[PDB]
Amino acid sequence: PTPQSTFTGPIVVDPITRIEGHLRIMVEVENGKVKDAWSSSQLFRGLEIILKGRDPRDAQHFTQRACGVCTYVHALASSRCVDDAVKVSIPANARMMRNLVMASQYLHDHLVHFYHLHALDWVDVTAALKADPNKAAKLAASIAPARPGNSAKALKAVQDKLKAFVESGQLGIFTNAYFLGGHKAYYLPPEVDLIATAHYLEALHMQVKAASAMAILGGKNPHTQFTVVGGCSNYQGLTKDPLANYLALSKEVCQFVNECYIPDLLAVAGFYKDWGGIGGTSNYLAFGEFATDDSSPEKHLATSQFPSGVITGRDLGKVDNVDLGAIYEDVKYSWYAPGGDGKHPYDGVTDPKYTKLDDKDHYSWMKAPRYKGKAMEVGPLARTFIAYAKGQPDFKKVVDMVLGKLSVPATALHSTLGRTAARGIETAIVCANMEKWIKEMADSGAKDNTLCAKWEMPEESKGVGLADAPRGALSHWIRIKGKKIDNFQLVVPSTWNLGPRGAQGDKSPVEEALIGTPIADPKRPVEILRTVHAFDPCIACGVH
Amino acid sequence: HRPSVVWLHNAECTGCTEAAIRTIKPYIDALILDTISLDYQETIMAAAGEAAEAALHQALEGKDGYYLVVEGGLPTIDGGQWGMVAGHPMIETTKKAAAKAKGIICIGTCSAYGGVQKAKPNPSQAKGVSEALGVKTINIPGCPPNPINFVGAVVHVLTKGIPDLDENGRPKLFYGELVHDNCPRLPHFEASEFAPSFDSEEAKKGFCLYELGCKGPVTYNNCPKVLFNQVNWPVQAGHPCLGCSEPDFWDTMTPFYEQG
Ligand code: SF4
Ligand code: SF4
Ligand code: FCO
Ligand code: F3S
Ligand SMILES: [Mg+2]
Ligand code: NI
């Protein structure tokens, strides 16, 4: 059974660490289970206000700084947004380059999230010291392909390095870890802790390689600099030698995803099967990504290889088309001026008005994005359900592989475990498509290196840029007046997932997901972290 | 004993943390296992909430003292309440941590000079660390800065002492030279061979990007010399420099695609 205390009372976790940005979670607990929850974002910057009156060409450079974890994605969304507003259709090569950089970003982002942000909620690093290295090696030999980094020698070397660190008494980032001195909610055997920890250290190195691949096309990471209105500027990124290096690096990263990431995710998930019945929501939204036709927002929605769609009430049989006109944001429970409810992003208002800490009427700097009155979960789980429901061949294969390995029904995916699994699922799929996508752009670039189209700045216009970033459905909306930015609104996946209640007082996806969370120890509420981290929160993104 | 480092996140995008972990000399694991004791870092630390806050206090109270790394600017409007951690205004916690710090390293343009949230009209009244605290800081600007520059400065400060700074608090080791002076497109600049647009043949031939707004000529950084991620930099990728290591570049270097 799932360890659960008898605690009745409030629990506040601030700061939520191992996420991007500043989040405060408040919950009411009764008899060891969360009965109510609040997602309180604690920083405002105001990029939408700062953008007013500026050159529309500048927007992508300002908005990229919405977030350095999901770097690039906002430059991409702004560029698509301005490209639509000036009505320019980018060259084929630009669509390819922009999509590959997004693919590279998924790879880097998801690896770092699983290992360096999420893993410490499931893995007891200090318990790894009690593991038998030889035993750990043979275990790793049964659940994953043969690799030198999984040998007894290599695993012992990790354990010794870890042992020297702990013995120093300077625990650094492990200081006051929830797993120190044992914790009922941590289930893994020590050998699995050692295996996961060894990969945690390997992944710190592998993420450098992932970033290098991305920079070949992106110019640098973090914060790429290769996109312009009408396409891209990186002519070298179409040439033979750089793309050979891009493929090589990408294959190294993909080997690590398939050898370490997926097998650790599967191993962890098998031990925490009870988490397949905790943290579920019901509505999913995706704008889709990796389109074959990006000439317009509707073409993006229709041609994304990771399909767009809307699922409501967990009904995997009725995937609706996205209606961009149906998106709006509320401010009733947010730190904004009254009278800003139900604003479609083209009519978006950002008028900050702070009240006080833990005010139940206003408790977040995030707006509350809604879709026909309903909260929507976005991200890997959303994309996975939508692609699965539409019968996307790759998603059918990999999801069934996972459902088999864990021996659960597809309905179990509506949970924190499922949310975590889906992130690994799409990472494997991105990897499977890399060599194809690269070959496509390599062949295309060799024949004709056209990369940026001609365009003209209109006096008055509007446009929208859509993307499915590593955390979900991202949209930038611009009104241009007198050739300047009259309004620029961002609606970001973490706004969907972690914003506060809507105008009806309905909970956001994270707030609903936390209801029913068991708490084994109120002072070390790892279970709250498990669910929150599974959404892969990005607060600078959510608030901007 | 490894020297204690306290790392605070204020008004930031976390791009500077991400830049830092791209270091390869040494890699980040080797840095935190062998060279420093990273005692607080919200992005990667295990503890959360009260446990995390207790970890901060333990580090601030440490007998051996600590160095302070600051990421992000400080939002000062409404008593600093638009940016809070553990129920405290960021300006308050940064003030307190800075008081007994052995040194203060500002990673990024945000902490150094105010950054993107300070850009007009600055709704949060965001300020750079030196202005908000009224003390000198070691500035490692760029948006984000090269890990070579950040880790380089950290190591220098722990082993040798304070490196020579310029008038803007930047180590001359990394920021002593203009981007432009080391750019491979310089011959084109000298020959007045400028790309008039990104779609032009000139751009395909790799002509200078000055007419497309390149702020390389007024930007101090080592980008063309050391590159990013061991593979590239903006001008090599065909895009003008934004001047991201200059104070207030959001308002002094815009419009980005013009020299006006
Ligand atoms: S300096 Fe740039 S990269 Fe660093 S936190 Fe600020 S906005 Fe982000
Ligand atoms: S591209 Fe920029 S940095 Fe290079 S020579 Fe021209 S103006 Fe200078
Ligand atoms: N992924 C990502 Fe960041 C968020 N939320 C964006 O867009
Ligand atoms: S934009 Fe910044 S990263 Fe270097 S190339 Fe210019 S200073
Ligand atoms: Mg917004
Ligand atoms: Ni983000």
By C-alpha distance, which of B255, B172, B246, B260 is closest to B216? B246
Rounded to whole angstroms, the maximal C-alpha distance in chain A is 70
Strand order in the sheet with B138-140: B37-40, B4-9, B67-71, B104-107, B138-140
Element (H, E) at A158: helix A152-167
CA distance A464 to A466: 7
Determine the Cα–Cα distance for residues B251 and A484; give it in Å rounded to an integer. Answer: 16
| Cα(B244)–Cα(A306) distance, integer angstroms | 34
Residue B10 CB less than 6 A away from ligand 1: no
Beta bridge partners of B11: B73
Q: What DSSP element (H or E) covers A306?
A: strand A304-306
d(CA A489, CA A74): 12
Q: How far apart are CA B147 and CA B16, in angstroms?
A: 9
Determine if ligand 4 sits within 6 Å of the CB of residue B249: no
Which residue of chain B comes nearest to A365, CA vs CA? B82
Cβ atoms A331, A340 nearer than 8 A? yes
Dig out the tokens for A310 from the structure: 């809307």
Q: Where are the alpha helices (DSSP H) in B100-216?
A: 109-113, 129-133, 147-159, 172-175, 186-190, 201-204
Q: Which residues pair with A481 in a beta bridge?
A: A484
Amino acid A440 reads: E
Longest dimension (CA), chain B: 63
Dihedral, CA of residue A294, residue A299, residue A301 and residue A302, to nearest 10:
-120
Find out whether A175 and B47 touch, Cβ atoms under 8 Å.
yes
Residue A253's φ and ψ, nearest 5 degrees, are -65, -40
CA–CA dist A47, A543 (Å, integer): 9
User: What is residue A342's three-state secondary structure?
Assistant: coil
Distance from CA of A325 to the nearest CA of B (A): 29
- CB contact set of B60 (below 8 Å; sequence gap of 6+): B6, B66, B96, B97, B100
Who's near A420: CB < 8 A, 6+ residues apart?
A: A114, A118, A265, A269, A275, A534
Structure tokens given for A52: 């007013």
β-bridge pairing B4-9 and B37-40: parallel
Q: What tokens appear for B201 in the block? A: 């043949």
β pairing state of A23-30 and A9-13: antiparallel
Element (H, E) at A462: strand A461-469
Distance CA A304, CA A314 (A): 22
> What is residue B145's DSSP assignment?
P
Structure tokens at A404: 């088999």
Q: Using a CB–CB cutoff of 8 Å, tell me whether B236 touches chain A.
A: yes
Q: Measured between alpha carbons, how far apart are the two ends of chain A, in Å?
A: 41
Assigned token pair, B16: 């500077």
Cα torsion A416, A419, A425, A427: sign = negative
Beta strands B138-140; B104-107: pairing state: parallel
Cβ(A133)–Cβ(A156) below 8 Å: yes
Distance CA A110, CA A92 (A): 27
Measured CA to CA, the distance from residue A422 to residue A114 in angstroms comes to: 11
Q: What is the resolution of this structure in A?
A: 2.0
Cβ-contact A427, A106 below 8 angstroms:
yes
Q: From 3.40.50.720, 3.30.365.10, 3.30.1050.10, 4.10.480.10, which CATH number describes the B175-259 domain?
A: 4.10.480.10
The Cβ of residue A462 has, within 10 Å, a number of other Cβ atoms equal to: 16
In ligand 1, which atom is closest to the CA atom of B109?
1
Rounded CA gap, A292 and A475, in Å? 19
Looking at residue B178, the DSSP 8-state letter turns out to be: B
Tell me the C-alpha distance between B246 and B128, whole Å. 13
- Put simply, the answer to whether A226 touches B238 (Cβ < 8 Å) is yes
CA–CA dist A343, A329 (Å, integer): 5
- Give me the count of residues in chain A: 544
How many helices and strands in chain B, by DSSP H and E? 13, 9
- For ligand 3, atom 5, name the residue with the nearest CA: A494
Cα within 13 Å of Cα(B180), Cβ side: 16
First-to-final CA distance of chain B: 53
Per the rule left: phi > 0, alpha: psi between -120 and 50, beta: everything else, B171 is: beta
- Do the domains at B1-174 and B175-259 have one common CATH topology? no
Please list, residue by residue across A490-521, b when 16 or more beta carbons sit within 10 angstroms of its beta carbon and e when fewer do: bbbbbbbbbbbbbbeebbbbbbbbbbebbbbb
Contacts with A449 from chain B: Cβ below 8 Å: 204
A324 Cα: distance to centroid of ligand 2 (angstroms): 41
Token pair of A82 as six digits:
């301005």
User: In this structure, how many other beta carbons lie within 10 angstroms of the beta carbon of residue A389?
Assistant: 19
- Distance, CA of B119 to CA of B115 (rounded, Å): 7
Which residues in A165-197 are b (16+ Cβ under 10 Å) and which e? beeeebbbbbbbbbbbeebebbbbbbbbbbbbb
CB A18 within 8 Å of CB A535: no
A223 vs B204: CB contact, 8 Å cut-off?
no
Residue A115 phi, psi (nearest 5) = -75, -60
User: Any chain A CB within 8 A of the CB of B20?
Assistant: no
**Distance (Å) from CA B217 to ligand 2 centroid:** 7
- In the DSSP assignment, the letter for residue A119 is G
- Any ligand 3 atom below 6 A from CB of A378: no
Q: How many domains does chain A have?
A: 1
Element (H, E) at A469: strand A461-469
The rounded distance, in Å, linking the Cα atoms of B107 and B162 is 15
Residues in chain B: 260
Backbone break loci in chain B, preceding residues, C–N > 2.5 A: none
Q: Helices A393-406 and A416-447, interaxial angle, to 10°?
A: 150
Test A223 with B144 for CB contact under 8 angstroms.
yes
Q: How far apart are CA A35 and CA A37, in angstroms?
A: 7
d(CA B107, CA B145): 7
Q: How many angstroms separate the Cα of A166 from the Cα of each of A125, A129, A169, A203?
A: 10, 9, 6, 20
How much of chain A is helix, strand and coil, in % rounded to 5?
A: 50, 15, 35
Domain CATH code at residue A130: 1.10.645.10
Dig out the tokens for B128 from the structure.
């750079």
Q: Per CATH, which fold does B1-174 belong to?
A: Rossmann fold (3.40.50)
The token duo for A433 is 């498509």
The token pair at A324 is 């961009």
A302 exposure class (CB count in 10 Å sphere: 0-12, 13-18, 19+): middle
Q: How many angstroms separate the alpha carbon of residue A352 from the centre of ligand 5?
A: 12
Distance (Å, rounded) from C-alpha A464 to C-alpha A301? Answer: 12
Determine the 3-state secondary structure of A58 from DSSP. helix
Question: Beta-carbon neighbour count of residue A454 at 10 Å?
Answer: 10
Q: Which residues pair with A39 in a beta bridge?
A: A25
Chain breaks in chain A (C to N over 2.5 A) after: none
Q: Which domain holds residue A359?
A: 1-544
For residue A250, give the 3-state DSSP assignment: helix
Q: Distance between CA atoms of A25 and A11, rounded to whole angstroms? A: 8
B179 lines ligand 4 (CB under 6 A): yes
Burial of A271 (0-12, 13-18, 19+ CB in 10 A): middle
Q: Is the CB of A99 under 6 A from ligand 3?
A: no
**Rounded Cα distance, A489 and A340, in Å:** 14
| Owner of token pair 């950054």 | B115
Catalytic residue IDs of A = 20, 67, 70, 74, 471, 494, 538, 541
* Measured distance CA(A21)–CA(A62) in Å, rounded: 18
Sorted by sequence, the CB contacts under 8 Å of residue A73 that are 6+ apart come out as: A67, A102, A105, A467, A469, A470, A474
Task: Give B102's DSSP letter.
Answer: S
Residue A359 DSSP symbol? B
Q: How far apart are CA A445 and CA A439, in angstroms?
A: 10
Cis amide linkage into residue B26, ω under 30° from 0:
yes
**Alpha helices (H) in A304-415, listed in sequence order:** 380-389, 393-406
Distance between CA atoms of residues A344 and B108, nearest Å:
35
* Nearest Cβ partner for A55 among B12, B14, B254: B254
Could you tell me the two tokens for A197? 């920890």
DSSP symbols for A218-276: HSSSSS---EETTEE--GGGGSHHHHHHHHHHHHHHHHHIIIIIHHHHHHHHHHTGGGG
Residues A153 and A399: their CA atoms lie apart, in Å, by 34
**Helix A73-85 to helix A92-112 angle, to the nearest 10 degrees?**
150
Q: Which residues contact A248 (CB under 8 A, 6 or more apart)?
A: none
